[PDB]
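can u pls check wat happens w/ zinc ion
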Amino acid sequence: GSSGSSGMGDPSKQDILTIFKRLRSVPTNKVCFDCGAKNPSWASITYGVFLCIDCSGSHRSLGVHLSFIRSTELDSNWSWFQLRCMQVGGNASASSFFHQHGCSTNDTNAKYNSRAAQLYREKIKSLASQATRKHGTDLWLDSSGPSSG
Ligand SMILES: [Zn+2]
């Protein structure tokens, strides 16, 4: 129940592109984890997966609370914590994670509304910290250049 202070600057386009350039590279990430559409702009931070304008729509219906959707080419006002969620997840990660439990469900309003799915989301939040906390904003990867102030 901690509101959370605000003493840091949001990630710029470049930085955001750097976090997506690494995830996109992957063949299982550059394809809508749902159908497999290549260059899946749409991305779901909740499950840190890649979706396509087609599928992404379904998620939006569920409710930003159930599955938040954010583009990569347009949406630039991303949150450090979020961005990571994508790196600390991946498509395959879920493709298996789910089965491991035994979802045996395809439906979007069900497969995602199932326990197996939930477990994932939470997990993403945790890991996201490992990367986020790391040198706070300073892109763990390397020193991009801290702006005076
Ligand atoms: Zn799709």
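Strands lie at 43-44, 49-50, 69-70.
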